[PDB]
Design a protein around this ligand. Structure first.
Ligand code: CLA
Ligand code: CLA
Ligand code: CLA
Ligand SMILES: C=Cc1c(C)c2cc3nc(c4c5[nH]c(cc6nc(cc1[nH]2)C(C)=C6CC)c(C)c5C(=O)[C@@H]4C(=O)OC)[C@@H](CCC(=O)OC/C=C(\C)CCC[C@@H](C)CCC[C@@H](C)CCCC(C)C)[C@H]3C
Ligand SMILES: CCCCCCCCCCCCCCCC(=O)OC[C@H](COP(=O)(O)OC[C@@H](O)CO)OC(=O)CCCCCCCCCCCCCCC
Ligand SMILES: CCCCCCCCCCCCCCCC(=O)O[C@H](COC(=O)CCCCCCCCCCCC)CO[C@@H]1O[C@@H](CO)[C@H](O)[C@H](O)[C@@H]1O
Ligand SMILES: CCCCCCCCCCCCCCCC(=O)O[C@H](COC(=O)CCCCCCCCCCCC)CO[C@@H]1O[C@@H](CO)[C@H](O)[C@H](O)[C@@H]1O
Ligand SMILES: CCCCCCCCCCCCCCCC(=O)O[C@H](COC(=O)CCCCCCCCCCCC)CO[C@@H]1O[C@@H](CO)[C@H](O)[C@H](O)[C@@H]1O
Ligand SMILES: CC(C)=CCC/C(C)=C/CC/C(C)=C/CC/C(C)=C/CC/C(C)=C\CC/C(C)=C\CC/C(C)=C/CC1=CC(=O)C(C)=C(C)C1=O
Ligand SMILES: CC1=C(/C=C/C(C)=C/C=C\C(C)=C\C=C/C=C(C)/C=C/C=C(C)/C=C/C2=C(C)CCCC2(C)C)C(C)(C)CCC1
Ligand SMILES: CC1=C(/C=C/C(C)=C/C=C\C(C)=C\C=C/C=C(C)/C=C/C=C(C)/C=C/C2=C(C)CCCC2(C)C)C(C)(C)CCC1
Ligand SMILES: CC1=C(/C=C/C(C)=C\C=C/C(C)=C/C=C/C=C(C)/C=C\C=C(C)\C=C\C2=C(C)CCCC2(C)C)C(C)(C)CCC1
Ligand code: OEC
Ligand SMILES: [Fe+2]
Lengths: 36, 34, 82, 37, 30, 35, 34, 64, 340, 335, 35, 36, 37, 30
């Protein structure tokens, strides 16, 4: 299968970068009670 | 079956038992003198 | 900490140390020397003496070839070897 | 070095996060293909 | 390769179904 | 007081001091093995 | 009893004499290159 | 707490926490299997290493 | 009792501690020092490398080394009473042997000594941590004296237990394993080297931020062995480097700890790296370059320029370093630049 | 104000400026700022360099085909050797480029400002009022960097052979050396590898003990490290219970109770060996290479018995031969 | 390009001069208790 | 330059994955005071 | 659905994070090259 | 390409120098 080369860093980073943001913002808040 | 090599080992075991054995005995001995 | 085992300065500076030892120390110094002089040290550890590293003619090295019948090798080398 | 008042905390709750993730995981699933050409 | 990328998403998502349904923030009647 | 001559401490200090001079003598001896 | 320094210097010279021997010994010693 | 079906069915086995035999008890017979073990490995290691020989026992790919 | 008598005794002070450990530390460790020593003074290493390894033979301090078993033995523990030697302390002394000895007896000395670090440690109400840090060498000595050799052909290619004979161990790697260019080894120097600084600095950094709490030109006595009193202003510290290097080691538990880490860590990264060399898994590679090394006969990086040195180190030493192969390289085959 | 410089004068010597900048400062600060700037770029994007006496260009820039390890900014060519090849002496900018003039800039610069940091290493120990046998520790370091960039060059006559700034470069500068100096067999380098190894062992020792007799102040959930506050009045460790252990662990008297002495031992060991080492290079800088025992052990007939150093030397020739193939236009590597 | 040659000196001199004139004004002062 | 293909997803993810961890754990703690 | 006690919070301070990052950013910088072969 | 990867690290690190020195957690004398 001859495909584009950035498929991984493209699709992948697309997932992990914004996702990591949300992840952060959640556990940053669920830790107001020091819980988490 | 007692191959010169095998016999070599027993010999080794015995020497092993000898050095450990002699060692502990003298050791329990001096420890006992206190 | 609380320490109590027979002191050093005591004996290195002791009159007896020097009298038991003076005589015995060089007894070892001498003993070692003799060990070398007799030339037994050589036979003691196979260690060849300059006079006999290579046979006279040959130029090759007496290298141990097979781990199991090695004892032979050494010989057969030390053998033909002077 | 005097604290600025406007230091309000930030908010993204146990759920909003599930959506945020469902939002990405999807496009990611959608565009992946076109990101491979 | 890229077909794992497809299957990884596909899957990671089925599990975003796990959490969002079973460890979802509950409705509090107050 | 009266501290023994055969001390734990001593057995060690000896295993070394005996050979050392045995060796040192051996070596000072080699210093001449010409030919 | 015997002064401490006096044992050090005579003990020392020996190390300095014996060691010295060793350096000579490297010139005529077997390990020389002649 | 909160027992259940197995939670009761298996309560004995977990019960005797501190249950400990008195003194040194069994130990000796441990140390006897202990050293008795060593020689096993060693005897294996040494057959393997090629230091221990036996017949119809020359360690090689050949072995049928 | 019967045990505790042995315990009670061997366990309490008496200057040179001797403990439950000592039983294996002292004996193994002793023999070991001896093992290496006897060899350098009297034992030859000719029948394995055709190389002189003893004062007695004429070798010097930097020459003497306790050989390493001919490539004919391989990894056989080469036992004094084993099939090979058959308790013939002269032949057994000749087939090298002392090696496996020194190495194995030794290998315990460490195991043993670290234990001692625990024993004395659990007895004095301290954190063993020292004993842990000590893995640093066990890992090295394990990998580098047992693992690597065990991974290669024979005990032969294993370290040499020499002064120079050990330097050979270097080059030989550089030349064949091109270790120098192996990430893992790198952290190995990143830690030793990095740590040394850490040591030399904390040592001096401390000395200077010392509170004059004595009288005159001897700040070495002015210190209280008796009680708690920060001898080095931790405050005159940070406010120093914070302004001279930009950073401040604010705390001493971490400082005096991070110093534990630095080395021990790198060492491991070394022990890993070499583990690689065991199965010839080495970082010589670097395709990206070599692939383009083919064409463009005019492109040159140090890597290659260096890698070439290696290629010489092989061709020249292999024949005499690895005697059991009876290598033969005619005048021609040897790689050389125009001139020499 | 009577004069406006008055403020410049206290600022430079501002005992409270986030980052102290002494009088050395005023030279260091930029000497490195220019030095670094040239560097960072030369690496990222710089042409090859004829280095060796010929016209064989050695590439050392990431943008020219270098892995971070292969990376390196190359030296000046045997063409210049010692002459001063500053950016203006070269005609076309590209000349300086090719003939490898960045080196001198980078080297000369840091190699300079470095020392001023050494000065400003102490200038803060004066404005701060602290004993200052500190700046000296730093010497050993700077000495070497100076040795590997300034002595050895003056020694062999060309900046050509001065540890090339780059990772794989060092490896090169090295392997070569062994070959031409048998450095590894040199009594100095020894005392060098001596301390370094030591310090790296002591650095883990003294760091080990302290944390091992750390003291009380924590739970198991809490981080034991937290038990301490900056500006403590009494040290966190229990020195007595430390020496009381270590001392015991083999000899009791080969131990330190004298914290001032110990922390000192840490200083001097690494710092002294490193010096010898720094001198080692600087020693062989004028060709007083390591020892040499080739053919030094022989038997009766004269048949020669290889010393375990003869191998050292064997592997050495393998090195001698190859290094810098093409230039060497004569039998003896007299440089 | 003889231009650069001078453009630098000044930049070099200036500094060397700022160096000396800073230490010249004697630093026995500018420490704890201006002594 | 003929190099390995995962260079990006390898080296890259190597950075962003562990890094993101630390990032999380910090802002998860610096948010105990609700600040951050 | 009864809370377990062992719910201790987690810790990584403004600095430890700088090191954690300096730790990775580096290896990353180191291995990158070998990750490209 | 990969040389940006080298330069990206190289750089984001110089900035980890920024923060760790200027926005570093300060030493509190108490
Ligand atoms: C004096 C100049 C100098 C510098 C800057 C370096 C730098 C380096 N060497 Mg090195 N080296 C040198 C001299 C130098 N070396 C000499 C004279 C030898 C002969 C023995 C060696 C032998 C050697 C080996 C065998 C190895 C290295 C390795 C390294 C790298 C690992 C980090 C390290 O060195 O830990 C030293 C301890 C420290 C505490 C250094 C901390 C400070 C770092 C940041 C120094 C480098 C920072 C960087 C260069 C700054 C760029 C300039 C500026 C614009 C930022 C690093 C790039 C390793 C490597 O190649 O990486 C895989 C490696 O395996 N070196
Ligand atoms: C693998 C299965 C197994 C396991 C996990 C155990 C575990 C145990 N048995 Mg046990 N036992 C077994 C099988 C087993 N047994 C068998 C088959 C028998 C014969 C029926 C016994 C008979 C027996 C008796 C009589 C006793 C025990 C006891 C014990 C307990 C003693 C505590 C202990 O282990 O410290 C011992 C820990 C060590 C010895 C660690 C030291 C080992 C290292 C230091 C070796 C050195 C490493 C070296 C580098 C390698 C050398 C090899 C080289 C030459 C190649 C322990 C729970 C004792 C007990 O209290 O029971 C509750 C006891 O009295 N056992
Ligand atoms: C240039 C800078 C440099 C630096 C800083 C290092 C640093 C290191 N190299 Mg190295 N190396 C270099 C260049 C460098 N190398 C070059 C250019 C080459 C050529 C390729 C090599 C080839 C090389 C090899 C092959 C190996 C190393 C290894 C090492 C590590 C050794 C660890 C150690 O401390 O010993 C560890 C010591 C022991 C394990 C034994 C400890 C024994 C103690 C416990 C007791 C002994 C003393 C006794 C008590 C007293 C009796 C003595 C008696 C004579 C009186 C260390 C990190 C080793 C390593 O890290 O492997 C992973 C290793 O095997 N290097
Ligand atoms: C430069 C090499 C090097 C040497 C030779 C060395 C030596 C030593 N390190 C010790 C300790 C340590 N080293 C430590 C970390 C490190 N040490 C390092 C590197 C070294 N450490 C590096 C890698 C790390 C950095 C942290 C820790 C912190 C300790 C300990 O705390 C301990 C100490 O307290 O020292 C004061 C001492 C322990 C003594 C002992 O266990 O004897 C008892 C038992 C022994 C040694 C018998 C072993 C017999 C085996 C090894 C046989 C080997 C025989 C050959 C190797 C001899 C050949 C000689 C050559 C000339 C070829 C001393 C032996
Ligand atoms: C030396 C390195 C490179 C050059 C070499 C030169 C060759 C010889 C040169 C001689 C002159 C060097 C003078 C150094 C002078 C020097 O370095 O100063 C070190 C330091 C000096 O203190 P200061 O003078 O800085 O103190 C401040 C006040 O004195 C000022 O009022 O104190 C010492 O270390 C004394 C040395 C004792 C050594 C003890 C070491 C620590 C533990 C040792 C204990 C072992 C046994 C313990 C049993 C319990
Ligand atoms: C200043 C000191 C302060 C601290 C640093 C000091 C560093 C000194 C380094 C010197 C080390 C090497 C000595 C020169 C070698 C030499 O030349 O002596 C040789 C044997 O040496 C030796 O036997 C070296 C002795 C070292 C053994 C240490 C073993 C550790 C156990 C000690 C326990 C003590 C209770 C004997 O000569 C050799 O062998 C001769 C044959 O008899 C040859 O003719 C040659 O001369 C050949 O060199
Ligand atoms: C070439 C670049 C690529 C490779 C990277 C370069 C390697 C640099 C080596 C530094 C690593 C050692 C860490 C220091 C110990 C420490 O200070 O650790 C903390 C962080 O400090 C730091 O380090 C901050 C990291 C940034 C410092 C580097 C700035 C470079 C500019 C210097 C120019 C000077 C003119 C500071 O405090 C620490 O954490 C505190 C809690 O906040 C504790 O209380 C302790 O003080 C503990 O030491
Ligand atoms: C040589 C130059 C090279 C350039 C860089 C070199 C710098 C090296 C510095 C390292 C110092 C030695 C060891 C540092 C440890 C340390 O830092 O420890 C913690 C740091 O956090 C940490 O970093 C924790 C490590 C977590 C890293 C996360 C990525 C790895 C797993 C990701 C998996 C994802 C799938 C901080 O301390 C810890 O936490 C403290 C609380 O803040 C406690 O007080 C204790 O000190 C405890 O040890
Ligand atoms: C090519 C490249 C970028 C790197 C090469 C490969 C690399 C970077 C490998 C590193 C990877 C690893 C884990 C290496 C080993 C791990 C490790 C901890 C090594 C030690 C080196 C290291 C990481 C940092 C060196 C620390 C150092 C030299 C100085 C920082 C500590 C310091 C400033 C001490 C002086 C100091 C002393 C003091 O008493 C007080 C009060 C203060 C305030 C101080 O600042
Ligand atoms: C290539 C590769 C790989 C990869 C992997 C991956 C990429 C992974 C992953 C992952 C994944 C792939 C994941 C996942 C998952 C998860 C899951 C899968 C889960 C789940 C969930 C579920 C199952 C659910 C359930 C449910 C719910 C939630 C509700 C509704 C419905 C139900 C109830 C059913 C491997 C390793 C293989 C190998 C090596 C390389
Ligand atoms: C390919 C590509 C790209 C990429 C990019 C990137 C990848 C980036 C980045 C980034 C980066 C690259 C970053 C960075 C940075 C930062 C910085 C650079 C900073 C800084 C800092 C500084 C500058 C500092 C300062 C200081 C300090 C900190 C202290 C000491 C020293 C001094 C003072 C100086 C681009 C977009 C281009 C384009 C498109 C595509
Ligand atoms: C092997 C053997 C053994 C044992 C052994 C021995 C007994 C060894 C020895 C010994 C020894 C134990 C040796 C050694 C030592 C020592 C010495 C003899 C030393 C040395 C030397 C020298 C020469 C030195 C010098 C010096 C010093 C001391 C330091 C400072 C510097 C100087 C130079 C002064 C066993 C039973 C196991 C088995 C059989 C065989
Ligand atoms: Mn770079 Ca000093 Mn070998 Mn001639 Mn070249
Ligand atoms: Fe300390």
């Amino acid at each position: 299968m001859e495909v584009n080369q950035l498929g991984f860093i493209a699709t992948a980073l697309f997932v992990l970068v914004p996702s990591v943001f949300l992840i952060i913002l959640y556990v940053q808040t669920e830790s107001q009670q020091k819980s988490s | 079956t007692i191959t010169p090599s095998l016999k070599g080992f027993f010999i080794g075991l015995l020497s092993g038992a000898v050095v450990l054995g002699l060692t502990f005995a003298v050791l329990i001995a001096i420890s006992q003198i206190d | 900490g609380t320490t109590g085992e027979r002191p050093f300065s005591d004996i290195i500076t002791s009159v007896r140390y020097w009298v038991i030892h003076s005589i015995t120390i060089p007894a070892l110094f001498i003993a070692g020397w003799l060990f070398v002089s007799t030339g037994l040290a050589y036979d003691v550890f196979g260690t060849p003496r300059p006079d006999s590293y290579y046979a006279q003619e040959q130029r090759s090295i007496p290298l141990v070839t097979d781990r199991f019948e090695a004892k032979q090798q050494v010989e057969t080398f030390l053998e033909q070897l002077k | 070095m005097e604290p600025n008042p406007n230091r309000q905390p930030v908010e993204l709750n146990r759920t909003s996060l599930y959506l945020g993730l469902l939002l990405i995981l999807v496009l990611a699933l959608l565009f992946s293909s076109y990101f491979f050409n | 390769m890229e077909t794992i990328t497809y299957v990884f998403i596909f899957a990671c998502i089925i599990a975003l179904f796990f959490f969002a349904i079973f460890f979802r923030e509950p409705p509090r009647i107050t | 007081v009266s501290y023994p001559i055969f001390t734990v401490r001593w057995v060690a200090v000896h295993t070394l001091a005996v050979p050392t001079i045995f060796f040192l003598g051996a070596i000072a001896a080699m210093q001449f093995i010409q030919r | 009893r015997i002064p401490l320094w006096i044992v050090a210097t005579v003990a020392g010279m020996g190390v300095i004499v014996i060691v010295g021997l060793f350096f000579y010994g490297a010139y005529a010693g077997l390990g020389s290159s002649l | 707490a909160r027992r259940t079906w197995l939670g009761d069915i298996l309560r004995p086995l977990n019960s005797e926490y501190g249950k400990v035999a008195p003194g040194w008890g069994t130990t000796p017979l441990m140390a006897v299997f202990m050293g008795l073990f060593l020689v096993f490995l060693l005897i294996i290691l040494e057959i393997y290493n090629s230091t221990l020989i036996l017949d119809g026992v020359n360690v090689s790919w050949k072995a049928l | 009792g019967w045990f505790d008598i042995l315990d009670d005794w061997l366990k309490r002070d008496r200057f040179v501690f001797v403990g439950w450990s000592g039983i294996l530390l002292f004996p193994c460790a002793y023999l070991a020092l001896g093992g290496w020593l006897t060899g350098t003074t009297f034992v030859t290493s000719w029948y394995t490398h055709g190389l002189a390894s003893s004062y007695l033979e004429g070798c010097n301090f930097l020459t003497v080394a306790v050989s390493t078993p001919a490539n004919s033995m391989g990894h056989s523990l080469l036992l004094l009473w084993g099939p090979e030697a058959q308790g013939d302390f002269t032949r057994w002394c000749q087939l090298g042997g002392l090696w496996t000895f020194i190495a194995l007896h030794g290998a315990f000395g460490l195991i043993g000594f670290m234990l001692r670090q625990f024993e004395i440690a659990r007895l004095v109400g301290v954190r063993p941590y020292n004993a842990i840090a000590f893995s640093a060498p066990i890992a090295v000595f394990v990998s580098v004296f047992l693992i690597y050799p065990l991974g290669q052909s024979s005990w032969f290619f294993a370290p040499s237990f020499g002064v120079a004979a050990i330097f050979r161990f270097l080059l030989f790697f550089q030349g064949f394993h091109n270790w120098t260019l192996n990430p893992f080894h790198m952290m190995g120097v990143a830690g030793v080297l990095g740590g040394a600084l850490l040591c030399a600095i904390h040592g001096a950094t401390v000395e200077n931020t010392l509170f004059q709490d004595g009288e005159g030109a001897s700040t070495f006595r002015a210190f209280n062995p008796t009680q708690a009193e920060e001898t080095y202003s931790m405050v005159t510290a940070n406010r120093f480097w914070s302004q001279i290097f930009g950073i401040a080691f604010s705390n001493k538990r971490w400082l005096h700890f991070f110093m534990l880490f630095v080395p021990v860590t790198g060492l491991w990264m070394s022990a890993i790296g070499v583990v690689g060399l065991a199965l010839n898994l080495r970082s010589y590679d670097f395709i990206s370059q070599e692939i383009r090394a083919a064409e463009d006969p005019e492109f040159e990086t140090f890597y290659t320029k260096n890698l070439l040195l290696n290629e010489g180190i092989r061709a020249w030493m292999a024949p005499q370093d690895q005697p059991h192969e009876n290598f033969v390289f005619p005048e021609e085959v040897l790689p050389r630049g125009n001139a020499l | 104000s009577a004069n406006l410089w008055e403020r410049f004068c206290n600022w430079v010597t501002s005992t409270d400026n986030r980052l102290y900048v002494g009088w050395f400062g005023v030279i260091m600060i930029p000497t490195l700022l220019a030095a670094t700037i040239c560097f960072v770029i030369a690496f990222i994007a710089a042409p090859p360099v004829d280095i060796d006496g010929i016209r064989e260009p050695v590439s050392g820039s990431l943008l020219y085909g270098n892995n971070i390890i292969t990376g390196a900014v190359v030296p000046s060519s045997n063409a210049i050797g010692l002459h001063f090849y500053p950016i203006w002496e070269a005609a076309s900018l590209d000349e300086w480029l090719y003939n490898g003039g960045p080196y001198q800039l980078i080297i000369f610069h840091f190699l300079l400002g470095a020392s001023c940091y050494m000065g400003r290493q102490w200038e803060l120990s004066y404005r701060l009022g602290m004993r200052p046998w500190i700046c000296v520790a730093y010497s050993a370091p700077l000495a070497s960097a100076f040795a590997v960039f300034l002595i050895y060059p003056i020694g062999q006559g060309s900046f050509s052979d001065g540890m090339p700034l780059g990772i794989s470069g060092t490896f090169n500068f090295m392997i070569v050396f062994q070959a031409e100096h048998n450095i590894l067999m040199h009594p100095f380098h020894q005392l060098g590898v001596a301390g370094v190894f030591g310090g790296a062992l002591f650095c883990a020792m003294h760091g080990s003990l302290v944390t091992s007799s750390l003291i009380r102040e924590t739970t198991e959930t809490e981080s034991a490290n937290y038990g301490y506050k900056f500006g403590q009045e009494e040290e966190t460790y229990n020195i007595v219970a430390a020496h009381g252990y270590f001392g015991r662990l083999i000899f009791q008297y080969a131990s330190f109770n004298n914290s001032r002495s110990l922390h000192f031992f840490l200083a001097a060991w690494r710092v002294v060996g490193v010096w010898f080492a720094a001198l080692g290079i600087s020693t062989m800088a004028f060709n007083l290479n390591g020892f040499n025992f080739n053919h030094s052990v022989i038997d009766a007939k004269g048949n020669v018995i290889n010393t375990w150093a003869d191998i050292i030397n064997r592997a050495n020739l393998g090195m001698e031969v190859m290094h810098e193939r093409n230039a060497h236009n004569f039998p003896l590597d007299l440089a | 390009m003889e231009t650069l040659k001078i453009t630098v000196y000044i930049v070099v001199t200036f500094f060397v001069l700022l160096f000396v004139f800073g230490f010249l004004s004697g630093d026995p002062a500018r420490n704890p208790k201006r002594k």
